[PDB]
Protein backbone atom coordinates (compact mmCIF):
# COMPACT_ATOMS: atom_id res chain seq x y z
CA UNK A 1 0.00 0.00 0.00
CA UNK A 2 1.34 3.42 -1.05
CA UNK A 3 0.45 6.58 0.87
CA UNK A 4 0.94 10.08 -0.51
CA UNK A 5 0.63 13.28 1.51
CA UNK A 6 -1.34 15.24 -1.11
CA UNK A 7 -3.27 14.38 -4.25
CA UNK A 8 -2.05 17.28 -6.41
CA UNK A 9 1.32 19.04 -6.64
CA UNK A 10 2.88 22.10 -8.28
CA UNK A 11 6.22 22.16 -10.13
CA UNK A 12 9.15 22.87 -7.83
CA UNK A 13 7.74 21.11 -4.76
CA UNK A 14 8.74 17.78 -3.22
CA UNK A 15 6.56 14.66 -3.00
CA UNK A 16 6.64 12.67 0.24
CA UNK A 17 5.51 9.06 0.02
CA UNK A 18 5.45 6.09 2.40
CA UNK A 19 5.26 2.39 1.53
CA UNK A 20 3.67 -0.11 3.92
CA UNK A 21 4.91 -3.69 3.49
CA UNK A 22 2.69 -6.47 4.88
CA UNK A 23 2.14 -10.14 4.07
CA UNK A 24 -1.07 -12.12 3.51
CA UNK A 25 -2.16 -11.74 7.16
CA UNK A 26 -1.91 -7.89 7.11
CA UNK A 27 1.01 -8.08 9.60
CA UNK A 28 4.26 -6.20 8.86
CA UNK A 29 7.19 -8.03 7.29
CA UNK A 30 10.59 -7.27 5.79
CA UNK A 31 11.11 -7.90 2.08
CA UNK A 32 12.89 -6.29 -0.86
CA UNK A 33 10.64 -3.91 -2.81
CA UNK A 34 11.30 -2.32 -6.21
CA UNK A 35 9.85 1.20 -6.53
CA UNK A 36 9.05 3.01 -9.80
CA UNK A 37 7.81 6.53 -10.60
CA UNK A 38 6.14 6.93 -14.01
CA UNK A 39 5.33 9.96 -16.17
CA UNK A 40 1.94 10.49 -17.92
CA UNK A 41 3.37 8.67 -20.96
CA UNK A 42 4.08 5.59 -18.84
CA UNK A 43 7.90 5.74 -18.76
CA UNK A 44 9.65 5.25 -15.38
CA UNK A 45 11.78 8.21 -14.30
CA UNK A 46 13.36 7.03 -11.02
CA UNK A 47 13.91 3.45 -9.82
CA UNK A 48 14.96 2.24 -6.37
CA UNK A 49 15.45 -1.08 -4.56
CA UNK A 50 14.76 -0.76 -0.83
CA UNK A 51 14.34 -3.21 2.03
CA UNK A 52 11.77 -2.90 4.81
CA UNK A 53 13.96 -4.92 7.20
CA UNK A 54 14.53 -3.35 10.65
CA UNK A 55 12.09 -0.53 9.81
CA UNK A 56 8.73 -1.86 11.17
CA UNK A 57 7.26 -2.11 7.68
CA UNK A 58 7.29 1.64 6.91
CA UNK A 59 9.54 2.96 4.13
CA UNK A 60 9.79 6.79 4.03
CA UNK A 61 10.85 8.15 0.65
CA UNK A 62 10.90 11.41 -1.30
CA UNK A 63 11.12 12.82 -4.83
CA UNK A 64 11.67 16.38 -6.02
CA UNK A 65 9.66 17.87 -8.89
CA UNK A 66 11.65 19.89 -11.46
CA UNK A 67 10.46 23.36 -12.44
CA UNK A 68 10.09 22.33 -16.09
CA UNK A 69 8.08 19.10 -16.05
CA UNK A 70 5.19 17.46 -17.88
CA UNK A 71 1.76 18.02 -16.36
CA UNK A 72 -0.88 15.32 -16.17
CA UNK A 73 -1.55 12.16 -14.17
CA UNK A 74 1.68 10.68 -12.80
CA UNK A 75 1.95 7.16 -11.41
CA UNK A 76 3.91 5.39 -8.66
CA UNK A 77 4.31 1.63 -9.11
CA UNK A 78 5.84 -0.85 -6.67
CA UNK A 79 6.24 -4.62 -6.44
CA UNK A 80 8.00 -7.29 -4.41
CA UNK A 81 11.31 -8.61 -5.71
CA UNK A 82 10.09 -12.22 -5.57
CA UNK A 83 6.72 -11.45 -7.26
CA UNK A 84 7.36 -9.03 -10.14
CA UNK A 85 4.11 -9.97 -11.91
CA UNK A 86 1.93 -8.36 -9.18
CA UNK A 87 2.23 -4.56 -9.35
CA UNK A 88 0.56 -2.07 -6.99
CA UNK A 89 -0.02 1.53 -8.04
CA UNK A 90 -1.34 4.92 -6.93
CA UNK A 91 -1.71 8.07 -9.04
CA UNK A 92 -1.34 11.81 -8.42
CA UNK A 93 -1.86 14.91 -10.57
CA UNK A 94 0.61 17.68 -11.43
CA UNK A 95 -0.95 21.05 -12.23
CA UNK A 96 -0.17 24.76 -11.94
CA UNK A 97 -2.69 26.12 -9.44
CA UNK A 98 -3.37 28.14 -6.31
CA UNK A 99 -5.51 27.13 -3.40
CA UNK A 100 -9.14 28.30 -3.20
CA UNK A 101 -10.84 29.66 -0.09
CA UNK A 102 -14.18 27.82 -0.29
CA UNK A 103 -15.66 24.53 -1.48
CA UNK A 104 -18.81 23.95 -3.55
CA UNK A 105 -20.81 20.76 -3.00
CA UNK A 106 -23.21 20.00 -5.86
CA UNK A 107 -25.76 17.47 -4.62
CA UNK A 108 -29.15 16.83 -6.26
CA UNK A 109 -32.21 16.15 -4.12
CA UNK A 110 -32.27 12.50 -5.22
CA UNK A 111 -29.33 10.30 -6.23
CA UNK A 112 -31.00 9.58 -9.61
CA UNK A 113 -33.63 11.00 -11.96
CA UNK A 114 -37.00 9.46 -12.80
CA UNK A 115 -38.19 9.95 -16.37
CA UNK A 116 -41.88 10.71 -15.76
CA UNK A 117 -41.23 13.10 -12.85
CA UNK A 118 -42.85 16.29 -14.17
CA UNK A 119 -41.06 18.36 -11.49
CA UNK A 120 -37.70 17.90 -13.21
CA UNK A 121 -34.34 17.48 -11.50
CA UNK A 122 -33.80 19.67 -8.43
CA UNK A 123 -30.16 20.29 -7.47
CA UNK A 124 -28.98 21.88 -4.21
CA UNK A 125 -25.85 24.07 -4.34
CA UNK A 126 -23.92 24.23 -1.05
CA UNK A 127 -21.02 26.68 -0.69
CA UNK A 128 -19.16 27.25 2.59
CA UNK A 129 -15.67 28.40 3.51
CA UNK A 130 -12.92 26.07 4.70
CA UNK A 131 -13.35 27.29 8.30
CA UNK A 132 -17.11 26.63 8.31
CA UNK A 133 -18.58 30.06 7.54
CA UNK A 134 -21.12 30.57 4.78
CA UNK A 135 -20.65 32.18 1.38
CA UNK A 136 -22.43 35.17 -0.19
CA UNK A 137 -22.37 35.63 -3.96
CA UNK A 138 -23.68 34.40 -7.30
CA UNK A 139 -23.61 31.02 -9.08
CA UNK A 140 -23.74 29.74 -12.67
CA UNK A 141 -25.22 26.24 -13.10
CA UNK A 142 -25.51 24.21 -16.34
CA UNK A 143 -26.70 20.61 -16.89
CA UNK A 144 -25.69 18.09 -19.54
CA UNK A 145 -26.05 14.52 -20.76
CA UNK A 146 -23.33 11.88 -21.11
CA UNK A 147 -23.49 8.78 -23.31
CA UNK A 148 -20.42 6.64 -22.66
CA UNK A 149 -17.53 9.09 -22.96
CA UNK A 150 -19.02 11.35 -25.66
CA UNK A 151 -20.53 14.24 -23.70
CA UNK A 152 -23.39 16.32 -25.10
CA UNK A 153 -23.96 19.63 -23.33
CA UNK A 154 -27.31 21.40 -22.83
CA UNK A 155 -26.99 25.19 -23.30
CA UNK A 156 -30.75 25.73 -22.85
CA UNK A 157 -30.46 25.10 -19.08
CA UNK A 158 -28.24 28.05 -18.13
CA UNK A 159 -29.47 29.77 -14.97
CA UNK A 160 -27.93 32.52 -12.83
CA UNK A 161 -29.07 32.30 -9.21
CA UNK A 162 -27.80 34.37 -6.28
CA UNK A 163 -26.34 32.42 -3.38
CA UNK A 164 -27.77 33.66 -0.07
CA UNK A 165 -26.53 32.30 3.30
CA UNK A 166 -24.41 29.62 1.60
CA UNK A 167 -27.37 27.98 -0.14
CA UNK A 168 -29.08 27.99 -3.51
CA UNK A 169 -31.63 26.07 -5.52
CA UNK A 170 -31.78 25.30 -9.25
CA UNK A 171 -34.20 23.11 -11.25
CA UNK A 172 -33.79 21.61 -14.72
CA UNK A 173 -37.23 21.41 -16.33
CA UNK A 174 -38.33 18.36 -18.30
CA UNK A 175 -39.36 20.39 -21.38
CA UNK A 176 -35.83 21.83 -21.64
CA UNK A 177 -34.34 18.32 -21.33
CA UNK A 178 -36.62 16.73 -23.94
CA UNK A 179 -35.89 19.59 -26.36
CA UNK A 180 -32.12 19.05 -26.15
CA UNK A 181 -31.94 15.49 -27.48
CA UNK A 182 -34.68 16.20 -30.09
CA UNK A 183 -36.35 12.97 -28.97
CA UNK A 184 -40.14 12.48 -29.15
CA UNK A 185 -39.85 9.24 -27.18
CA UNK A 186 -38.84 9.56 -23.54
CA UNK A 187 -37.87 5.90 -23.03
CA UNK A 188 -34.57 6.14 -24.95
CA UNK A 189 -32.93 8.20 -22.18
CA UNK A 190 -32.79 5.11 -19.94
CA UNK A 191 -29.13 4.24 -19.43
CA UNK A 192 -27.70 7.70 -20.03
CA UNK A 193 -26.46 9.81 -17.13
CA UNK A 194 -26.63 13.50 -16.26
CA UNK A 195 -23.88 15.84 -15.08
CA UNK A 196 -24.16 19.22 -13.36
CA UNK A 197 -21.47 21.90 -13.20
CA UNK A 198 -21.58 24.96 -10.93
CA UNK A 199 -19.41 28.08 -10.77
CA UNK A 200 -19.84 30.32 -7.70
CA UNK A 201 -18.31 33.82 -7.73
CA UNK A 202 -17.88 35.96 -4.60
CA UNK A 203 -19.22 39.50 -4.24
CA UNK A 204 -15.67 40.90 -4.06
CA UNK A 205 -14.73 39.16 -7.31
CA UNK A 206 -11.51 37.86 -5.77
CA UNK A 207 -12.05 34.09 -6.15
CA UNK A 208 -14.27 31.55 -7.89
CA UNK A 209 -14.60 27.76 -7.72
CA UNK A 210 -15.81 25.30 -10.36
CA UNK A 211 -17.43 22.09 -9.12
CA UNK A 212 -19.01 19.15 -10.93
CA UNK A 213 -21.22 16.20 -9.98
CA UNK A 214 -21.42 13.57 -12.72
CA UNK A 215 -22.89 10.11 -13.11
Amino acid sequence: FIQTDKTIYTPGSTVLYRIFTVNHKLLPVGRTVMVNIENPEGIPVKQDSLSSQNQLGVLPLSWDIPELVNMGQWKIRAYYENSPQQVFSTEFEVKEYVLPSFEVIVEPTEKFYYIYNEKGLEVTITARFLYGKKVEGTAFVIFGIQDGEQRISLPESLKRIPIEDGSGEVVLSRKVLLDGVQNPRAEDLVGKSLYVSATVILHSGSDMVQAERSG
Binding site: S13, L16, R18, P60, S62, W63, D64
Partner: protein
Protein backbone atom coordinates in the same frame (compact mmCIF):
# COMPACT_ATOMS: atom_id res chain seq x y z
CA UNK B 1 15.06 26.95 19.39
CA UNK B 2 15.45 23.38 18.18
CA UNK B 3 15.26 21.79 14.74
CA UNK B 4 13.86 18.44 13.62
CA UNK B 5 13.28 17.24 10.07
CA UNK B 6 10.57 15.09 8.50
CA UNK B 7 10.76 11.36 7.82
CA UNK B 8 13.39 10.30 5.32
CA UNK B 9 15.62 13.34 5.88
CA UNK B 10 19.01 13.70 7.58
CA UNK B 11 19.69 16.63 9.89
CA UNK B 12 23.18 18.10 9.56
CA UNK B 13 24.43 21.06 11.54
CA UNK B 14 23.54 22.01 15.08
CA UNK B 15 20.18 20.57 16.11
CA UNK B 16 20.07 22.76 19.25
CA UNK B 17 20.92 26.44 18.72
CA UNK B 18 21.05 29.31 21.23
CA UNK B 19 20.87 33.09 20.81
CA UNK B 20 23.99 34.66 22.33
CA UNK B 21 24.82 38.15 23.61
CA UNK B 22 26.24 39.28 20.24
CA UNK B 23 22.87 38.88 18.50
CA UNK B 24 23.93 35.71 16.68
CA UNK B 25 22.82 32.09 16.98
CA UNK B 26 25.30 29.51 18.23
CA UNK B 27 26.67 26.48 16.39
CA UNK B 28 26.31 25.66 12.72
CA UNK B 29 23.28 26.17 10.48
CA UNK B 30 20.69 23.39 10.62
CA UNK B 31 19.97 21.83 7.22
CA UNK B 32 17.38 19.19 6.30
CA UNK B 33 18.67 17.39 3.22
CA UNK B 34 17.52 14.33 1.29
CA UNK B 35 20.70 13.68 -0.70
CA UNK B 36 19.16 13.84 -4.18
CA UNK B 37 21.28 16.66 -5.64
CA UNK B 38 24.79 16.70 -7.06
CA UNK B 39 25.48 19.51 -4.63
CA UNK B 40 24.20 19.42 -1.07
CA UNK B 41 21.44 21.66 0.25
CA UNK B 42 22.95 25.12 0.95
CA UNK B 43 20.29 25.60 3.61
CA UNK B 44 18.71 28.72 5.03
CA UNK B 45 20.76 30.79 7.50
CA UNK B 46 18.56 32.42 10.11
CA UNK B 47 17.28 35.77 8.84
CA UNK B 48 17.64 34.98 5.12
CA UNK B 49 15.33 33.82 2.32
CA UNK B 50 16.45 31.28 -0.28
CA UNK B 51 15.14 31.41 -3.86
CA UNK B 52 15.81 28.12 -5.64
CA UNK B 53 14.65 24.62 -4.72
CA UNK B 54 16.60 22.75 -7.42
CA UNK B 55 20.02 21.57 -6.22
CA UNK B 56 21.25 19.98 -9.45
CA UNK B 57 24.44 20.85 -11.31
CA UNK B 58 24.86 24.39 -12.75
CA UNK B 59 21.93 25.61 -10.60
CA UNK B 60 21.84 28.84 -8.60
CA UNK B 61 20.24 30.25 -5.45
CA UNK B 62 19.77 33.87 -4.38
CA UNK B 63 19.52 35.16 -0.81
CA UNK B 64 17.83 38.19 0.72
CA UNK B 65 17.89 39.48 4.30
CA UNK B 66 15.00 41.04 6.22
CA UNK B 67 14.04 44.72 6.44
CA UNK B 68 16.79 46.93 7.84
CA UNK B 69 19.42 44.17 7.75
CA UNK B 70 22.65 44.07 5.74
CA UNK B 71 23.72 40.95 3.86
CA UNK B 72 27.24 39.70 4.58
CA UNK B 73 28.61 37.14 2.16
CA UNK B 74 27.47 36.02 -1.29
CA UNK B 75 24.06 37.07 -2.55
CA UNK B 76 24.17 34.40 -5.28
CA UNK B 77 25.73 30.94 -5.05
CA UNK B 78 26.20 28.45 -7.88
CA UNK B 79 26.75 24.68 -7.71
CA UNK B 80 30.13 23.85 -9.25
CA UNK B 81 31.63 20.59 -10.53
CA UNK B 82 32.70 18.37 -7.64
CA UNK B 83 29.84 19.10 -5.23
CA UNK B 84 30.79 22.50 -3.82
CA UNK B 85 28.79 25.73 -3.95
CA UNK B 86 30.47 28.90 -5.13
CA UNK B 87 30.90 31.91 -2.87
CA UNK B 88 30.31 31.73 0.87
CA UNK B 89 27.40 31.12 3.21
CA UNK B 90 25.52 34.37 3.96
CA UNK B 91 24.76 35.81 7.39
CA UNK B 92 22.45 38.74 8.10
CA UNK B 93 24.29 41.44 10.05
CA UNK B 94 22.78 44.51 11.70
CA UNK B 95 23.98 48.02 12.57
CA UNK B 96 25.22 46.84 15.97
CA UNK B 97 26.27 43.17 15.74
CA UNK B 98 30.05 43.72 15.26
CA UNK B 99 32.48 40.87 15.94
CA UNK B 100 34.07 39.64 19.15
CA UNK B 101 37.89 39.90 19.24
CA UNK B 102 38.22 36.11 19.51
CA UNK B 103 36.10 35.38 16.41
CA UNK B 104 38.16 37.77 14.24
CA UNK B 105 41.61 36.20 14.62
CA UNK B 106 40.17 32.67 14.77
CA UNK B 107 38.78 32.82 11.23
CA UNK B 108 41.52 35.03 9.76
CA UNK B 109 44.36 32.58 10.42
CA UNK B 110 42.40 29.55 9.17
CA UNK B 111 42.09 31.32 5.81
CA UNK B 112 45.67 32.58 5.69
CA UNK B 113 47.45 29.28 6.39
CA UNK B 114 45.67 27.63 3.44
CA UNK B 115 47.32 30.02 0.96
CA UNK B 116 50.69 29.61 2.73
CA UNK B 117 51.28 25.83 2.79
CA UNK B 118 50.63 25.62 -0.95
CA UNK B 119 53.38 28.20 -1.51
CA UNK B 120 55.78 25.76 0.27
CA UNK B 121 58.73 25.09 -2.03
CA UNK B 122 59.67 33.07 -2.41
CA UNK B 123 56.39 32.81 -4.33
CA UNK B 124 53.82 34.85 -2.38
CA UNK B 125 52.98 38.56 -2.42
CA UNK B 126 51.20 40.39 0.42
CA UNK B 127 49.77 43.88 -0.15
CA UNK B 128 49.10 46.23 2.78
CA UNK B 129 46.74 49.20 2.33
CA UNK B 130 45.92 51.57 5.20
CA UNK B 131 43.24 54.26 5.21
CA UNK B 132 44.40 57.69 6.36
CA UNK B 133 41.11 59.53 5.94
CA UNK B 134 40.03 62.37 8.21
CA UNK B 135 36.99 60.37 9.39
CA UNK B 136 39.28 58.10 11.46
CA UNK B 137 41.48 60.57 13.37
CA UNK B 138 45.13 61.33 14.05
CA UNK B 139 44.95 59.42 17.34
CA UNK B 140 43.64 56.32 15.52
CA UNK B 141 46.57 55.98 13.06
CA UNK B 142 49.54 55.37 15.37
CA UNK B 143 47.55 52.70 17.20
CA UNK B 144 47.12 51.02 13.81
CA UNK B 145 50.86 51.27 13.09
CA UNK B 146 51.73 49.16 16.16
CA UNK B 147 49.07 46.63 15.15
CA UNK B 148 50.67 46.02 11.74
CA UNK B 149 54.09 45.26 13.26
CA UNK B 150 52.74 42.10 14.93
CA UNK B 151 51.42 40.80 11.59
CA UNK B 152 54.80 40.43 9.88
CA UNK B 153 56.44 38.27 12.56
CA UNK B 154 53.55 35.78 12.60
CA UNK B 155 53.89 35.25 8.83
CA UNK B 156 57.67 34.81 9.11
CA UNK B 157 57.14 32.25 11.91
CA UNK B 158 56.14 29.63 9.30
CA UNK B 159 59.50 29.63 7.50
CA UNK B 160 58.01 31.45 4.48
CA UNK B 161 59.39 34.89 3.56
CA UNK B 162 56.93 36.60 1.19
CA UNK B 163 57.23 39.96 -0.57
CA UNK B 164 55.47 42.88 1.11
CA UNK B 165 53.94 46.07 -0.24
CA UNK B 166 53.21 49.11 1.94
CA UNK B 167 50.88 51.81 0.57
CA UNK B 168 49.12 54.38 2.75
CA UNK B 169 46.49 56.51 1.03
CA UNK B 170 43.84 59.18 1.51
CA UNK B 171 43.30 61.60 -1.36
CA UNK B 172 46.37 60.25 -3.20
CA UNK B 173 48.28 56.96 -2.88
CA UNK B 174 51.77 57.01 -1.37
CA UNK B 175 53.97 53.97 -2.05
CA UNK B 176 56.47 53.32 0.75
CA UNK B 177 57.51 49.73 -0.07
CA UNK B 178 57.01 48.28 -3.55
CA UNK B 179 56.94 44.55 -4.22
CA UNK B 180 59.41 45.00 -7.12
CA UNK B 181 62.34 45.80 -4.80
CA UNK B 182 65.32 43.65 -3.89
CA UNK B 183 64.64 44.16 -0.16
CA UNK B 184 60.87 43.53 -0.11
CA UNK B 185 61.26 39.82 0.73
CA UNK B 186 63.47 40.61 3.74
CA UNK B 187 60.82 40.62 6.47
CA UNK B 188 62.98 42.54 8.96
CA UNK B 189 63.67 45.39 6.51
CA UNK B 190 59.97 46.09 5.89
CA UNK B 191 59.38 46.33 9.66
CA UNK B 192 62.04 49.06 9.80
CA UNK B 193 60.13 50.96 7.10
CA UNK B 194 56.88 50.76 9.09
CA UNK B 195 58.24 52.92 11.92
CA UNK B 196 59.79 55.43 9.49
CA UNK B 197 56.45 56.33 7.88
CA UNK B 198 54.79 59.61 8.82
CA UNK B 199 51.14 60.55 8.30
CA UNK B 200 51.49 64.34 8.34
CA UNK B 201 51.08 64.62 4.56
CA UNK B 202 47.97 62.39 4.49
CA UNK B 203 46.39 64.55 7.22
CA UNK B 204 46.74 67.62 4.99
CA UNK B 205 45.01 65.79 2.12
CA UNK B 206 42.01 64.59 4.13
CA UNK B 207 39.90 62.36 1.92
CA UNK B 208 38.83 58.81 1.07
CA UNK B 209 39.76 58.02 -2.55
CA UNK B 210 39.74 54.22 -2.45
CA UNK B 211 39.82 53.79 -6.24
CA UNK B 212 43.12 55.61 -6.83
CA UNK B 213 44.76 53.49 -4.11
CA UNK B 214 43.74 50.21 -5.75
CA UNK B 215 44.99 51.55 -9.09
CA UNK B 216 48.42 51.73 -7.45
CA UNK B 217 48.06 48.12 -6.30
CA UNK B 218 47.16 47.19 -9.89
CA UNK B 219 50.29 48.95 -11.18
CA UNK B 220 52.50 46.98 -8.76
CA UNK B 221 51.31 43.54 -9.88
CA UNK B 222 50.84 44.30 -13.59
CA UNK B 223 53.70 43.80 -16.01
CA UNK B 224 54.44 46.33 -18.82
CA UNK B 225 54.38 44.01 -21.86
CA UNK B 226 56.62 41.49 -20.09
CA UNK B 227 54.91 38.53 -21.85
CA UNK B 228 53.81 35.67 -19.76
CA UNK B 229 55.84 35.78 -16.54
CA UNK B 230 57.14 32.67 -14.79
CA UNK B 231 54.87 33.12 -11.78
CA UNK B 232 51.76 34.16 -13.68
CA UNK B 233 50.09 30.79 -13.12
CA UNK B 234 52.00 30.16 -9.86
CA UNK B 235 51.88 33.04 -7.35
CA UNK B 236 49.44 33.52 -4.46
CA UNK B 237 48.36 37.12 -3.87
CA UNK B 238 46.97 38.32 -0.52
CA UNK B 239 45.48 41.82 -0.22
CA UNK B 240 44.87 43.20 3.28
CA UNK B 241 43.21 46.57 3.82
CA UNK B 242 41.54 48.54 6.61
CA UNK B 243 38.87 51.12 5.79
CA UNK B 244 35.55 52.50 7.02
CA UNK B 245 33.66 51.95 3.75
CA UNK B 246 32.82 55.67 3.44
CA UNK B 247 34.53 56.55 0.16
CA UNK B 248 33.55 59.74 -1.66
CA UNK B 249 36.32 60.34 -4.23
CA UNK B 250 37.49 58.48 -7.29
CA UNK B 251 34.33 56.46 -7.70
CA UNK B 252 33.29 52.83 -7.28
CA UNK B 253 36.40 50.87 -6.21
CA UNK B 254 34.86 47.55 -7.30
CA UNK B 255 35.81 48.26 -10.94
CA UNK B 256 39.51 47.98 -10.03
CA UNK B 257 38.90 44.62 -8.31
CA UNK B 258 37.42 43.09 -11.48
CA UNK B 259 40.46 44.29 -13.44
CA UNK B 260 42.74 42.46 -10.98
CA UNK B 261 40.91 39.13 -11.32
CA UNK B 262 41.05 39.42 -15.12
CA UNK B 263 44.82 39.96 -14.99
CA UNK B 264 45.34 36.89 -12.77
CA UNK B 265 43.17 34.62 -15.01
CA UNK B 266 40.48 34.13 -12.35
CA UNK B 267 36.97 33.32 -13.54
CA UNK B 268 37.98 33.31 -17.23
CA UNK B 269 37.75 29.50 -17.35
CA UNK B 270 35.25 26.81 -16.39
CA UNK B 271 37.73 24.01 -15.63
CA UNK B 272 40.21 26.13 -13.63
CA UNK B 273 38.74 28.92 -11.48
CA UNK B 274 42.01 29.83 -9.67
CA UNK B 275 40.21 31.30 -6.65
CA UNK B 276 43.04 30.34 -4.27
CA UNK B 277 45.40 32.83 -5.97
CA UNK B 278 43.62 35.98 -4.74
CA UNK B 279 42.36 36.54 -1.19
CA UNK B 280 41.02 39.92 -0.04
CA UNK B 281 40.49 40.71 3.65
CA UNK B 282 38.67 43.87 4.79
CA UNK B 283 38.67 45.04 8.43
CA UNK B 284 36.22 47.60 9.81
CA UNK B 285 37.79 50.12 12.16
CA UNK B 286 35.00 52.31 13.54
CA UNK B 287 31.29 52.40 14.32
CA UNK B 288 30.91 54.60 11.23
CA UNK B 289 31.02 51.61 8.86
CA UNK B 290 29.12 50.86 5.65
CA UNK B 291 28.82 47.08 5.84
CA UNK B 292 27.62 46.89 2.22
CA UNK B 293 30.78 48.44 0.77
CA UNK B 294 33.19 46.33 2.84
CA UNK B 295 31.41 43.11 1.87
CA UNK B 296 31.55 43.71 -1.90
CA UNK B 297 35.32 44.26 -1.85
CA UNK B 298 36.28 41.16 0.15
CA UNK B 299 36.57 37.68 -1.31
CA UNK B 300 33.93 34.98 -0.81
CA UNK B 301 35.55 31.56 -0.41
CA UNK B 302 33.77 28.46 0.82
CA UNK B 303 33.31 27.88 4.58
CA UNK B 304 35.36 30.97 5.37
CA UNK B 305 34.98 34.59 6.49
CA UNK B 306 36.71 37.70 5.10
CA UNK B 307 34.62 40.63 6.42
CA UNK B 308 35.18 41.96 9.94
CA UNK B 309 33.58 44.79 11.94
CA UNK B 310 35.04 45.95 15.28
CA UNK B 311 34.98 49.16 17.30
CA UNK B 312 37.43 51.38 19.30
CA UNK B 313 40.60 50.25 17.40
CA UNK B 314 42.38 48.95 20.55
CA UNK B 315 40.44 45.67 20.42
CA UNK B 316 41.76 45.15 16.88
CA UNK B 317 45.23 45.50 18.38
CA UNK B 318 44.06 42.86 20.87
CA UNK B 319 43.38 40.38 18.05
CA UNK B 320 46.94 40.64 16.68
CA UNK B 321 48.73 39.69 19.90
CA UNK B 322 46.18 36.89 20.40
CA UNK B 323 46.82 35.33 16.98
CA UNK B 324 50.52 34.81 17.73
CA UNK B 325 49.60 32.90 20.89
CA UNK B 326 47.35 30.74 18.69
CA UNK B 327 49.29 27.86 17.10
CA UNK B 328 47.98 26.46 13.82
CA UNK B 329 48.48 22.73 13.22
CA UNK B 330 50.07 22.81 9.76
CA UNK B 331 49.07 19.83 7.61
CA UNK B 332 51.28 18.73 4.72
CA UNK B 333 48.87 15.85 3.99
CA UNK B 334 46.62 15.94 0.94
CA UNK B 335 48.53 18.80 -0.70
CA UNK B 336 48.79 18.61 -4.49
CA UNK B 337 49.79 21.90 -6.12
CA UNK B 338 49.66 22.15 -9.91
CA UNK B 339 53.29 21.92 -11.06
CA UNK B 340 53.94 21.60 -14.79
CA UNK B 341 55.66 18.21 -14.61
CA UNK B 342 52.53 16.08 -14.45
CA UNK B 343 54.04 12.61 -14.36
CA UNK B 344 52.39 10.17 -11.96
CA UNK B 345 53.28 10.10 -8.24
CA UNK B 346 53.05 13.92 -8.43
Amino acid sequence: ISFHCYDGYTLRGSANRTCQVNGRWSGQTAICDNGAGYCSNPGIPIGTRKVGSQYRLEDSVTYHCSRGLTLRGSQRRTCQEGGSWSGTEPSCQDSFMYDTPQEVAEAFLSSLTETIEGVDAGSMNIYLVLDGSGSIGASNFTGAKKCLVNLIEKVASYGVKPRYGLVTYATYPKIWVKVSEADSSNADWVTKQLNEINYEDHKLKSGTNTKKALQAVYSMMSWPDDVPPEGWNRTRHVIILMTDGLHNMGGDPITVIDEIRDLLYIGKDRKNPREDYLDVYVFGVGPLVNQVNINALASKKDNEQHVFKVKDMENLEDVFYQMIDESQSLSLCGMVWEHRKGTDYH
